[PDB]
Design a protein around this ligand. Structure first.
Ligand SMILES: Nc1ncnc2c1ncn2[C@@H]1O[C@H](COP(=O)(O)OP(=O)(O)O)[C@@H](O)[C@H]1O
Ligand SMILES: Nc1ncnc2c1ncn2[C@@H]1O[C@H](COP(=O)(O)OP(=O)(O)O)[C@@H](O)[C@H]1O
Ligand SMILES: Nc1ncnc2c1ncn2[C@@H]1O[C@H](COP(=O)(O)OP(=O)(O)O)[C@@H](O)[C@H]1O
Ligand SMILES: Nc1ncnc2c1ncn2[C@@H]1O[C@H](COP(=O)(O)OP(=O)(O)O)[C@@H](O)[C@H]1O
Lengths: 436, 435, 130, 445, 442
């Protein structure tokens, strides 16, 4: 389940918080940033309460300060069965959808409906199957013996059950699941009988089982529109769904909640790099947040006073002031030496790399000096240099060798700036020849 | 249970029978003149005599333009069509922007049809076709818990019955007017014919076979336009898997529109349909190109144009698509002649305090008096929307300390945790690299 | 695929191939949005939008049907109501080469009278080879 | 009826005599005693129909009556003559070229007239008897068709029976049969057989049984534009493209073929050409490519008469970097004659306001109408025209039948024009978002 | 009769092997351009050269378009002529290169002659003759089919193949119908029903056609004219089969596609093969692109490429610019808006503006064609307008003068009629003077 090699945020299992929403210094893979974690815990409580809608928050700070780490912590603390959509700023610039339509689809993907239904099921291990044919074979008679670990029974079959058993061959000793009302029979496997391999089911054979469904508003939006089927949820060409089906879906969902047949589960939409949206997207986002079925929007940006896209002026955070008026802003700060070394030790534990104390100190020094991501990339590349000399622990010499082999930002700018005759400039001039 | 999103304390304009507005009634505080002008416009819409009337309401940000348009929509009632819109939605990659404007115009004119639902439901007891090979009629006997009833049927409904594979003992649903046939399932009394079968068993209906009900259908002109202009062809009732070719939005010819108008007028003359004109509302009108602004001039001169309401917060701003045209509110001078402008005023301290108290009441929160004074001072110092957004984290921080009433300390912690635009810009200015 | 496989006088061979990806749908959405019942109006609105307010209906818009019949040359005035209310695949399957009257505004293009000659033309003809 | 009171629906035709002399106020139009005469000359130029492809230009200040003049020409043109009214922004299409959209708008304004003589047999079918020969190649038929008054018996051919088996007809079915053309339609089912089936079905409809004679003779005249023939002769089933707009860049070869076909029909005598007027409101926002195509597309024999309206001075032509008079290049202005409209005085504004208040069922006092006239002299005319309609509702909120001075004063107080909006914007410019995005939301500094 | 800015020019107006006279063919003046255009007409009629470009240049309203239509009139109706505007090439379906190549291929015509052997007439009898010894397991084994025909002054019975019986049964041919039998392929088809059976049934839905004239059997040589673009779009469109894709594309919107060079190559080789047999004949025509200042430089480079082809026609361009930048380039100042690489490939013909007498004669002939009678002093006044404001402003002010004359119940156009026409309709100069001295937000 959920195959993954190692992620860059794989150590974050949530927000480290107490029962009084106080952040521990080291919990759940998150260290430091006490005020930002407290604010994100308040936002998490806002989402889990579910009584308010359409509030936008902004996580702003310098680069490499843990904004995406905060978003991943909120997403892991939400758990399953709550919608979480994560998009980038450049994702909505489509050739087949308008920008407002893509933003609308991303908005309605983040709110879901919890529907609870029950179905009656058959589960057991097949003992013996008899199919009988007549002289002409016009009618078919049958008997099926099926057992669990507690009972055993024999059923008399009709024509459509016999046809459904002949199709998708079922032999003796197979564990199968039968849905009577739909006629779908699945082979769970084979029982443990030497004389795939699953165990024989226990308890009753006729079980009424309850399955809790959660379906987003965008799925019912696609299915209710007749212009395409449910295969557009996978192929991805929905093609500018009309508004009137969305008002029908809104009214139907409202009366479903009134009757008690459904519950509304709002979620979080996360927009990473929100400064790359046009001003039309910002103006749509301003008026899309006052709807009753609107999620809580999280935006993350790292710019200063920069040019807003599609305009000719400059704005704080790259966003216009009317969008910033409806936002509450969480500010992240830079890290210390101890926080950097704790981050590097946690990244060592997740990458299964054993480090010396001196190697950790050198990594902390070069991480304070250059970048946190540079040391977090150097630590995994030092282990291969250590393993080429056939030893397990990563020492100082491996870190110095990796620091010599792989450059960083400021050093690369420094070697470029006194060798610029060999590189292609903004004017397209270069010197390739060695002499003259 | 109950959700709240930036509104829903606004219930109406809050006017008396003379058209004058009270101070605090209907969820509105302040702004008497804009509310009275909007009530006059609501009366004009209810008169149902004029077409192509354009109103612009202008003012600063967070002054109450969208609340006024929502109050118009609540005062008109659910019967009148109301089509809210943002100006950025008129740009699409499928059709031109003028065609999208035409569709949004025609979405605001509605119709009311009075129809009757007639339903036969029960267990099939007799199914006897007969030849007149072509069958002339089939006789179906239906049974419920309150008796049985037999029906003659046309052969088309027998064809639809043969589509659904209906045998003796199935519970079916027949609609008399449309002719739709739905098979609910085999009846519960025939459930022990086999020990195991692929058929679902449903009980008998406990009511009568015959059911009669009067209903009202509300459609718009755009529904008839898109129903009469399917390019691929008429879709069936049920298509779980998609159409083989993707149907794309097209440029609907005005000949189709005049045919739809002719048919609708013919049905109106017979007393079947009722014409309900409505309101088209375009928020952030400064985000329109000049070509849409030119097309609005001819679109307002049609005989079936609705009442159009526009909003803007800009000042003397260059019109989009132009480079040397400076016009008030971002609206070009050719179009600005055709409207009537309703001015909207900023608020005072006491109005801000009353708005904050009303928002705390609708969100089911209790606040202290000193917390209310601090929130009012914060609202006058930063913005009105900041205190309204900061009201709910104050309630959460009061909840985590096992209390039910917000005090000054929770407001101080919420002010510490979350910033406004001014303090964020102050941090942005005095920073080394990118905040 | 996930088909019916054997975990080893004729043998039955029935098509049973499925997709491993399963999309689950609740019964409430289907029964309250897609199927007609007493508490919804799928059939009523379908009839209202497809039959009564259709502009190709000869019981209400006979002038348009006669105009289109003079334009195209269809011998039946119910041809347009039949074309507009059936899908494109069903139209292109059961399409027949029925005759049309000469007194119409639709005549034959040059490309069509080039193509209709060489349907059964043999080789070595100049028009057939070109 | 599906028409409400529009902006200018009082204008019913051009107010002229037989000698092309305009009356001071007749049939809706007040004043403009030279533009109305020029538009009457243009109307006679259209109604003669002997010349083709000429463009006129209606230039003047805003709120002067250019589109009022175009509406007058449209209403006095009469029916069965094509009149296309488009804007300059319509032709910028995602799926059509600008030149192709211009060609479609040109060919939508010139049509031909076709005369059809029908012999209809409309009645209810009683019984159908089918008789076959010994060989069985052909089938004979007996039809008994019945009206309220009389009933007779007709015969059928083999193709009649084949066409009648399709769209399956039984007893109680209302059909109509053409003698000359053999057209078949199924009108629906009689109301006399509406109580037997007990459930309707999907494809059935109930119509009344016809009365009168069975065989009725009536002639029909059809007016078909050239664009309709272009769309029909471009595809297998082209009428859906007529009603959905997905024609998509029709080739020139079928257009030349249709032009030759129309010339052949005119020479033989089964059709005659009815030319029309194309009206392009706000022509100044057209590309230089569009102006070039309009220049070279007016020299064809099948070209209508083009009316363009402009309210621009010496502005910059779109698609270029220089400025030109009326926003149009000099090559198009060489191929034009210009009708100039001039602004009004107090009396003409008074008469126009009285006419507009007469149409909207609004009763004004003399002093209220004088106040509206003064406001229309000071501000624009349309501001007073809208003030009438809102003051009417202010009057019924006071329980009064006719409006007074107080209602006009209240409507002046509650609603603003352009100059007052500019003034209140300019004296409080810190509360509005400027071109650089700066604004101040907080009220306390 | 409809007149639209033209149709008073009938050819150029030269004599044989000599100078064009001043009064001929509706042309006044422009003698050197008429002689050069006559030399161009002789070059086209020589049917030798390919890819020759001619640009005619001059001021507005000088007679460039009139010279192009004079070229088209002098060549004849059989030679193809494709008039073009420079804005027509920008399309939203294909690239402008493909549109230029399509209009390039539209200007080459092909003349194909063919001999048809036919068999038409009313069906008299229709008898599938049985064989002498039938095969077992079958019924009605046809040995041959006897069909009798009937036309005007002719009656002939035919012995046919057994295999046309399926063609009889598909087209539903019965007795009394009139059919059409091609000789070599068979392949009968129903023209209609005979006119003698029109009163057979009270009500019917059939098409009764007169009985055909002439003999049943005849040999007719048919000469057909097509262009190469028709051959390209016929060969690109797949031949009518039973696949769903072909009939689907028939039922859908016919979007244009980029025709490959391979198909054009095969079309050229089969056309040259049948030209070498003495059957077909190639007729090159004229592609006239007017106001070529509006073309992008990519189209100019593709014109440079496509003028070197073997099958190219003669292309005529026209422009009214002087020193103007080429579109798509910010600094290439070039004569007539044409880049200098193309200008080297073409010859330039110069057109000169007119005088008082030429304007007066042109106005007189336009009034003659428009069926109006103008008094001589009114003609002198109109010539004064023509030399004072514009020739075209004088030409468009003839029909309002006739309308004002008919309003006053006169068939003569006189001085006060053209004074009222001055007063009612303005030209560009007075409109500009009104625009410059008015500040009423105009
Ligand atoms: N407080 C923290 N606790 C644990 N890991 C952190 C913390 N802050 C940053 N990181 C790690 O640092 C790396 C880079 O930080 P990132 O969140 O990508 O920066 P940004 O906020 O600019 O996106 C990530 O792998 C993240 O897991
Ligand atoms: N007079 C008022 N009374 C109560 N609430 C108001 C009033 N004016 C504005 N508001 C509130 O202010 C919030 C933002 O106002 P909004 O309608 O967005 O103004 P604008 O559209 O001009 O920005 C809304 O949630 C609305 O409820
Ligand atoms: N001659 C006229 N007679 C009556 N009403 C007029 C006249 N000219 C203009 N109007 C009125 O002025 C209003 C707007 O004028 P309009 O025709 O739009 O001027 P323009 O076309 O120059 O913008 C119209 O509603 C029309 O009722
Ligand atoms: N030499 C000529 N003889 C007769 N008529 C002419 C002559 N030159 C120009 N014209 C007339 O002048 C009108 C406009 O000329 P046009 O072809 O538009 O010139 P250009 O192509 O230079 O713009 C045409 O209607 C044409 O009949």
């Amino acid at each position: 389940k959920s195959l993954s090699l190692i992620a860059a945020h794989s150590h974050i299992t949530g927000l480290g918080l107490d029962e009084n929403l106080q952040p521990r210094p080291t919990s759940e893979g998150m260290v430091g940033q006490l005020q930002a974690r407290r604010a994100a815990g308040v936002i998490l409580k806002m989402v889990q309460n579910g009584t308010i809608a359409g509030r936008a928050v902004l996580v702003a700070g310098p680069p490499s300060t843990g904004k995406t780490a905060l978003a991943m912590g909120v997403s892991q603390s939400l758990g399953k069965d709550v919608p979480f959509t994560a998009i980038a700023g450049s994702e909505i610039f489509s050739l087949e959808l308008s920008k407002t339509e893509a933003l609308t689809q991303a908005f309605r993907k983040s709110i879901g409906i919890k529907i609870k239904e029950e179905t009656e099921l058959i589960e057991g291990e097949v003992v013996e199957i008899q199919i009988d044919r007549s002289i002409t074979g016009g009618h078919k008679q049958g008997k099926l013996t099926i057992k669990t670990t507690d009972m055993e029974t024999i059923y008399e079959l009709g024509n459509k059950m016999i046809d459904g058993l002949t199709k998708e061959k079922v032999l003796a000793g197979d564990v199968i699941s039968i849905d009577k009302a739909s006629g779908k029979i699945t082979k769970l496997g084979r029982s443990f009988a030497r004389s795939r391999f699953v165990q024989c089911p226990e308890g009753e054979l006729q079980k009424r089982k309850t399955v809790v469904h959660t379906v987003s508003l965008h799925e019912i939006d696609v299915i209710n529109s007749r212009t395409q089927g449910f295969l557009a949820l996978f192929t991805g060409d929905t093609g500018e769904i009309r508004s009137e089906v969305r008002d029908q879906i809104n009214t139907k969902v409202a009366e479903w909640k009134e009757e008690g047949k459904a519950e509304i589960v709002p979620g979080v939409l996360f927009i990473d790099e929100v400064h790359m949206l046009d001003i039309e997207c910002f103006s749509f986002i301003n008026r899309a947040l006052e709807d009753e079925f609107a999620p809580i929007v999280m935006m993350a940006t790292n710019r200063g006073v920069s040019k807003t896209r599609g305009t000719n002026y400059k704005s704080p955070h790259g966003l216009p002031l009317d969008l910033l008026d409806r936002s509450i802003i969480i500010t992240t700060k830079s890290y210390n030496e101890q926080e950097i070394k704790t981050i590097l030790s946690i990244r060592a534990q997740e990458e299964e790399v054993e480090l010396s104390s001196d190697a950790l100190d050198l990594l902390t020094k070069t991480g304070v000096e250059t970048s946190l991501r540079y040391s977090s990339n150097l630590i995994s590349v030092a282990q291969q240099i250590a393993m080429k000399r056939k030893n397990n622990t990563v020492e100082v010499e491996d870190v110095k060798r990796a620091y010599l082999l792989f450059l960083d930002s400021a050093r690369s700018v420094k070697y470029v700036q006194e060798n610029e005759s060999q590189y292609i400039d903004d004017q397209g001039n270069v010197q390739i020849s060695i002499a003259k | 249970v109950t959700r709240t999103a930036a509104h829903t304390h606004i219930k109406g304009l809050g006017l008396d029978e003379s058209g004058v507005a009270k101070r605090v009634e209907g969820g509105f505080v302040g702004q008497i003149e804009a509310r009275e002008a909007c009530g006059v416009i609501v009366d004009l819409i209810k008169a149902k005599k004029m077409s192509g009337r354009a109103i612009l309401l202008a003012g600063g940000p967070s002054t109450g333009k969208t609340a006024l348009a929502l109050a118009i929509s609540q005062e008109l009632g659910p019967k009148v069509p109301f089509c809210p819109l943002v100006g950025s939605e008129l740009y699409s990659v499928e059709v031109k922007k003028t065609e999208t404007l035409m569709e949004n115009f025609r979405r605001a004119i509605g119709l009311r049809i009075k129809e009757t639902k007639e339903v036969y439901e029960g267990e099939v007891t007799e199914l006897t076709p007969e030849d007149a090979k072509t069958i002339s009629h089939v006789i179906v006997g239906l049974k419920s818990a309150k008796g049985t009833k037999t029906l003659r049927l046309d052969p088309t409904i027998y064809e639809s019955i043969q589509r659904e594979k209906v045998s003796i003992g199935d519970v079916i649903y027949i609609e008399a007017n449309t002719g739709a046939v739905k098979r609910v399932g085999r009846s519960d009394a025939y459930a022990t014919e086999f020990d195991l079968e692929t058929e679902e068993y449903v009980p008998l209906p406990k009511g009568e076979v015959h059911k009669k009900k009067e209903i009202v259908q509300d459609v718009t002109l755009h529904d008839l336009d898109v129903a009469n202009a399917r390019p691929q062809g008429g879709q069936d009732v049920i298509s779980m898997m998609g159409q083989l070719l993707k149907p794309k939005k097209t440029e609907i010819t005005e000949k189709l529109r005049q045919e739809v108008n002719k048919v609708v007028a013919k049905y109106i003359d017979q007393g079947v349909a009722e014409l309900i004109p409505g309101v088209l509302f375009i928020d952030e009108v400064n985000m329109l190109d000049i070509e849409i602004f030119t097309y609005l001039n001819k679109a307002l001169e049609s005989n079936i144009a609705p009442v159009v309401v526009l909003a803007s917060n800009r000042g003397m701003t260059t019109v989009r698509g132009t480079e040397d045209v400076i016009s008030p509110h971002g609206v070009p001078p050719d179009l600005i002649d055709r409207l009537l402008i309703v001015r909207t005023l900023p608020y005072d301290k006491d109005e801000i305090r009353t708005i904050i108290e009303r928002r705390a009441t609708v969100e089911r929160l209790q606040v202290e008096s000193s917390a209310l004074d601090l929130l009012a001072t914060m609202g006058t110092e930063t913005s009105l929307r900041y205190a309204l957004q900061l009201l709910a984290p104050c309630g959460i921080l009061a909840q985590t300390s096992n209390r039910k009433e917000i005090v000054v300390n929770d407001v101080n912690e919420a002010k510490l945790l979350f910033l406004d635009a001014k303090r964020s810009t102050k941090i942005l200015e005095t920073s080394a690299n990118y905040l | 695929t996930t088909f019916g496989k054997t975990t080893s006088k004729f043998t039955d061979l029935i098509y049973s191939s499925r997709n491993p990806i399963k999309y689950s749908l609740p019964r409430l959405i289907y029964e309250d949005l897609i199927l007609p019942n007493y508490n919804n109006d799928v059939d009523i609105a379908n009839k209202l939008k497809n039959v009564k307010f259709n502009i190709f209906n000869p019981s209400t818009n006979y002038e348009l049907c006669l105009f289109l019949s003079k334009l195209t040359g269809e011998p039946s005035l119910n041809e347009f109501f039949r074309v507009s209310t059936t899908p494109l695949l069903k139209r292109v399957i059961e399409r027949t080469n029925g005759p049309k009257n000469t007194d119409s505004l639709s005549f034959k293009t040059i490309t069509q009278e080039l193509l209709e000659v060489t349907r059964n033309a043999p080789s070595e003809g100049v028009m057939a080879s070109l």
